[model samples]
Target: MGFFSRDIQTMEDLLLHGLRDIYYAEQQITKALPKMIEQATNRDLSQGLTSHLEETQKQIERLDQVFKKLGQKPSGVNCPAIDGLIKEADETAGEIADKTVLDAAIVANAQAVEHYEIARYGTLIAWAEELGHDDIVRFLTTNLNEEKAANTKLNTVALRAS
Candidate 1:
């Protein structure tokens, strides 16, 4: 059901909408991270993204568990928010040929992604709690914690890079 189509009548429907949106965004991040890793000139930055790629895969597994617990198949709606974020990342990376500048951009771009995910996961956790799905909150909290840690590591790498 479409987001604005008045199809989300229940808390379950709204939770599913948010879940699918984040799920889709994570998948897209998986596709984008490799390119980001390749574009990163700094050693720590590349490794950080690489490690996060692995974490993203595990996060998807957690999302799968969430879907299974909800008695639903894991799938995602097309998320324009992530689409726009990645587009900006690609455009900015493409225009910059300078390695140092590009690495800096990579850090900024990835932080933007991490912040978006942090927001989504935070909201999802609260929604799950409101729906009395404490187990789901635990699963989502694990992902949220990872995103926060990843953001902090990126900040470290950025500082070291500069």
Candidate 2:
């Protein structure tokens, strides 16, 4: 089933759907970051991608707990949004011939992904609060905070690259 399939009819259902979306997004990111790190020429950029990969794994674990708290198994639906972001990142990276330029492109691509995550987590947190799941909100907020910080760090690296 998918969103807009008429299967999600309540607030709780919507929240669960959002959770699955991010679960899928984060899982894709775990794979995406390593390739980015390999392509990154700048020391700080590679290091940032490496650490974010670790943080992403932890974020996935947090999602697992979130699913457990809801008495649901962790499962991800196909999120075209994340797939598109990742695909675009790959495409853009492929066209860049200079490693330095590539590093900047990576940060730009990464920040796009981060902003998407920030939006998702922010929305999810609001939904969780409305649905009265304080515990879930905590986990989501943790993830959100990390995403925000990552986005900020990416900008810092981008400026330094410039």
Candidate 3:
């Protein structure tokens, strides 16, 4: 994602690049969530992660639909924002020894990931609407709502963690 590489200069480029960016990010989360679920000492937390993992799979399918609708093949661009967040979660979670405390850490880390997701979706939605992509806007709105719900759930569990 080097700036001034002359790669993304148009509205379509921005939209498509952002789409590819999160496409990879969602894949990253799929790998991370199963591990998070395994390490989660709280039953509710593990269950929630499991649910998210399934929803994430659906989300990826939805993204593939987006690609098809856009007349492009499904693909991804490297995303440091998500990769860095994933790394932070792993590092912090690895450092914690207490089970309940680990659950709390997982909640905190997950909320951070959700926050970034909302940011990306929000920007993409706005751009899509501005570009008159009514159908695409609806598609992204669905994903945005899911991300918000997960964030709320994490906070709710955060309050009750161990």
Pairs clashing within candidate 2 = none
lDDT of each: 0.93, 0.92, 0.90
* Candidate 3 clash pair list: none
Better of 2 and 3 by TM-score: 2
Q: What C-alpha lDDT does candidate 2 achieve relative to the native structure?
A: 0.92
Question: Considering summed lDDT, which 10 consecutive residues are worst modelled in model 2?
Answer: 1-10
Worst-scoring 10-residue span by lDDT in model 1:
1-10
| TM-score of predicted structure 3 | 0.93
Candidate 3 lDDT over residue span 17-114, tens digit each: 99999889999999999999998988889999999999888889888888888998657587899999999999998899898888989998999999
